[PDB]
Design an enzyme around this catalytic site. Structure first.
Site, PDB file in Angstrom:
ATOM      1  N   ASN B 265     -70.080  18.848  20.062  1.00 24.16           N
ATOM      2  CA  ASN B 265     -69.114  18.087  19.293  1.00 24.16           C
ATOM      3  C   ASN B 265     -69.908  16.969  18.637  1.00 24.16           C
ATOM      4  O   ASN B 265     -70.511  16.145  19.327  1.00 24.16           O
ATOM      5  CB  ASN B 265     -68.042  17.506  20.219  1.00 24.16           C
ATOM      6  CG  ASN B 265     -67.081  16.594  19.490  1.00 24.16           C
ATOM      7  OD1 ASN B 265     -67.428  15.469  19.129  1.00 24.16           O
ATOM      8  ND2 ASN B 265     -65.865  17.078  19.258  1.00 24.16           N
ATOM      9  N   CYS B 326     -65.428  15.689   1.720  1.00 22.47           N
ATOM     10  CA  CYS B 326     -64.812  16.618   0.786  1.00 22.47           C
ATOM     11  C   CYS B 326     -63.298  16.442   0.793  1.00 22.47           C
ATOM     12  O   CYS B 326     -62.555  17.322   0.357  1.00 22.47           O
ATOM     13  CB  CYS B 326     -65.200  18.065   1.121  1.00 22.47           C
ATOM     14  SG  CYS B 326     -64.857  18.596   2.819  1.00 22.47           S
TER      15      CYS B 326
END
Ligand SMILES: [K+]
Ligand SMILES: [K+]
Lengths: 382, 382
Positions: B265, B326
Site C-alpha cells: 500500500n 489525473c
C-alpha cells in the site's frame, strides 16, 4: 554574530521562503554581510543581511556552514555548472547564468550574451565578492561587465556605476537565437534589448506559419523576428519609438523586410484594427507588467482581459493566440481564468497548444512565489 | 428536426462549452441522433443528442451544415490528420487518435497501439456509424477493435460488448516508446496497460540519472521501465499483484534486471521507508484519481498532500520528485498549492524543473474545462 527573527520570520524560513523583512528581525549585526539566522537558539539558515533595508534577510542555505562566504561561492559554482552544457553547445546564444533567489544567490544576476557576461549585484554582500564572481566566469567568457546602476542598489547603500570587470567589453554584440540573430547593446545609456526570459517562447513561435501576424507590445521585436520567418506580413506594435528602432535594426540584420513597425498605443490600435475589419492568423501579446503591487490586481485583470478579448476577435479560424503576463501578482490561476473569460466573451473556442513560462536558466522556486512571474500560453482558434 | 434550448443552455453554447444538460433543453427529437441546436430561431451548433440522458447535448460544430453526419465524419478525418505525421515516423508507437470532446468528436475515443486501433464509443449516434469509423481508420491501421463495454454506455441505452471491426485483432501487441517496449493486452478481460496520456511524461524521465528510484502507484510499470536505464536500482510499487505481474513481464521484455516490484500500500510503504531511514534520488507519484466528483476534493486534497509530503521526505538533496494527478476536479491551481504545502510542511525547498500535463494527442479546450484532467510536474530538492 547572529540574526534573531521573531516567530513570523521563523515560520517563513521553515517553509523555505527566502525572505524575512525588517519588522520581523528582533536583533542583528551592525553591518551588512553574511550571517546565520536563528529563532531563539534554533539555527534556521545562512543569509545575506542588511540592517538598513526593508528586505533585511535573504537566505541562501538552510544548514550551517563553517565559512559563510565559501558557502555562498559554492552556490555560485553550482549555478554556473547548470549552464555549462548549453554554453559549449550554443556559444553565441544568450542565457542567464545566475538568477538571484532562483539559484539561491539572492542579490546577484549574471547574463551571458555570446561570450560577454554582464553582472548586476543588488545586495551589499556581493560587492566585495565581484572579483571572485568574475574569476568564476572567466572559463566561460571573453569579458565581464559590472552593470551596477540599478536603482535598487540605492536601498542597500551601494554606489551606482557601470565598469568592466574582466577583458574588453564591446559596445554591441550579435546573439544567435535559433534561425535569427539580434544585436545587444552593452552601453549604459542604451537598451540591452535581449529579454532572455522570453528566449524559449520566441523560438517556440518558429513552428507557426500563415499570412499575417501581429506582435503587440513588440519592445525590441524579438517575437516579430521569429514570426517573420513563417509569416508574409508581421506588424510589430509598440509605444516606444526607441524600441521600434532596435526592432527595425534587428529585422535589417536578418534581411527580414516583411516586418513593419507601428508606433501606437496597443489598446487603441487593437480596437481600431477590429473596427476596420482587419484579421490576422496570429497575435502575440507580451505586455509589460500591468500589476505592480498586490493592490493593482483587480484593475490589471480587467486590462489583461480587454486586450486579450480584442486580440481573439482579430483571429480567423485556425488562428493562433500567444499571450503572456510578466506580473507575478497576476498569478497563473488568475491568468488562465482571464484568458478563458476573454475567449468565452469572444464566442471563440480555443484549443490549448502549449502552457509555458520561464526557461530553465530563469529558475522558479515553489516555496518562494515571487520567483514565478512569467506565464506564456499558446492557443488555437477552432 | 431540431433541438431547442433555453437561455441558459444557449449561453453555455455561445461561450463554446460543448455540453447542455437535459434541464436546459426545451424540446428535441424523439430519438437519439445528430441534430442542429437552436435558441429560438437562432442556430447555435450541430450536436449529438439523446432525449433519454442527463447530458442531452454534446456539440461538435458551431456552424451549420447540410449533412450533419458528413460534418461529424469530417471532424473525424481532421482528428486523424493531426496524428498522420507521428504515425508516419513512428508506426510502432502508441498514440491516441481521437480524444472525444477535445477533438470535437464527443462520445468517441480511439487509441492506436503499434498499428492496432481500439475504439470506445459512449454516445448513441456513434453506434450506427461504427462501420464508417472503421473505414476512416483503415488507411492508418492493421486492425480495429470495438471495445464498447464501458458501463457509461448504459446511460445512453447502448449494449455492452467487445468485437472486431476491421482486420484480425491480436490478443496482445508490443509498443515501442523511446528506449523501451511494453505489452498491451487487447483482450476484453485483461488490463490494456498502455496509459498513453503519460507517454511523453514517461519519456521525459529518461534524462535523469541516480542510484535508487522509487515508482509509486506503478501500474503497469511504465515509469520504472524508463528509469531503469538511468538508475542503478528501481523499485516499482503497487497494490495490484496483477499489475506488478505485467510490470515484471515488461521488465523482462526489455532485459531489465534492475527493476524490483514490491506489492504494498503506497501510503503505508512511504511512511515505513521514511522511518526506516531510506532515501532515494528520485520518486515518481502517479496515483489513480482521488477525486471523481467536485465533492471529493476536500478529502482528496488531504490524500494527495500526505503522499506528496511522504515522498518529499524520502528524497536526498538534489533528489527529483515527479508528481501527478489525473483528477479533473483537483484543478491545476489546487494541485500546485498542494505540492507547495507539502514542501513547506516538509521543510524542503523545491526548484520547479518542469510543469507538464496532457500530450498533443489528448487535446484540451480552454472553453470546456472537463477536457483537462492530467497534471504532471517535476521538482528538484535544493
Ligand atoms: K545596455
Ligand atoms: K484490454
Amino acid at each position: 554574530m547572529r540574526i534573531q527573527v521573531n516567530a513570523k520570520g521563523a515560520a517563513r524560513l521553515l517553509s523555505r521562503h527566502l525572505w524575512v523583512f525588517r519588522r520581523d528581525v528582533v536583533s542583528g549585526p551592525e553591518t551588512p554581510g553574511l550571517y546565520p539566522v536563528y529563532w531563539g537558539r534554533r539555527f534556521l539558515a545562512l543569509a545575506l543581511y542588511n540592517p538598513h533595508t526593508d528586505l533585511a534577510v535573504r537566505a541562501y542555505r538552510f544548514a550551517p556552514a563553517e565559512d559563510p562566504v565559501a558557502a555562498l561561492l559554492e552556490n555560485l559554482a553550482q549555478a554556473l555548472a547548470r549552464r555549462e552544457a548549453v554554453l559549449r553547445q550554443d556559444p553565441e546564444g544568450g542565457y542567464r547564468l545566475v538568477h538571484a533567489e532562483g539559484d539561491l544567490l539572492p542579490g546577484l544576476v549574471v547574463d551571458y550574451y555570446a561570450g560577454h557576461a554582464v553582472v548586476q549585484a543588488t545586495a551589499h554582500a556581493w560587492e566585495g565578492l565581484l572579483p571572485q564572481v568574475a574569476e568564476a566566469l572567466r572559463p566561460h567568457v571573453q569579458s565581464v561587465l559590472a552593470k551596477n546602476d540599478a536603482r535598487t542598489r540605492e536601498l542597500e547603500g551601494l554606489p551606482l556605476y557601470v565598469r568592466p570587470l574582466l577583458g574588453e567589453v564591446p559596445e554591441r554584440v550579435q546573439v544567435q537565437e535559433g534561425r535569427v540573430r539580434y544585436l545587444v547593446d552593452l552601453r549604459a545609456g542604451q537598451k540591452t534589448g535581449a529579454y532572455l526570459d522570453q528566449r524559449e517562447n520566441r523560438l517556440y513561435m518558429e513552428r507557426f506559419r500563415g499570412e499575417r501576424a501581429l506582435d503587440v507590445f513588440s519592445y525590441a521585436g524579438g517575437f516579430a523576428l521569429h514570426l517573420a520567418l513563417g509569416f508574409r506580413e508581421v506588424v510589430a506594435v509598440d509605444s516606444s519609438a526607441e524600441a521600434l528602432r532596435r526592432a527595425e535594426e534587428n529585422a535589417r540584420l536578418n534581411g527580414l523586410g516583411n516586418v513593419r513597425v507601428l508606433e501606437a498605443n496597443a489598446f487603441d490600435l487593437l480596437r481600431r484594427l477590429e473596427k476596420e475589419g482587419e484579421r490576422f492568423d496570429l497575435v502575440v501579446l507580451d505586455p509589460p507588467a500591468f500589476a505592480k503591487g498586490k493592490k493593482d490586481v483587480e484593475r490589471a485583470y480587467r486590462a489583461y482581459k480587454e486586450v486579450n478579448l480584442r486580440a481573439i476577435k482579430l483571429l480567423k479560424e485556425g488562428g493562433i493566440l500567444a499571450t503572456a503576463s510578466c506580473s507575478h501578482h497576476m498569478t497563473e490561476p488568475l491568468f488562465y481564468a482571464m484568458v478563458a473569460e476573454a475567449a468565452q466573451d469572444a464566442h471563440r473556442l480555443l484549443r490549448v497548444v502549449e502552457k509555458r513560462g520561464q526557461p530553465f536558466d530563469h529558475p522558479v522556486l515553489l516555496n518562494h512565489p515571487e520567483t514565478h512571474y512569467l506565464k506564456f500560453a499558446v492557443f488555437q482558434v477552432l
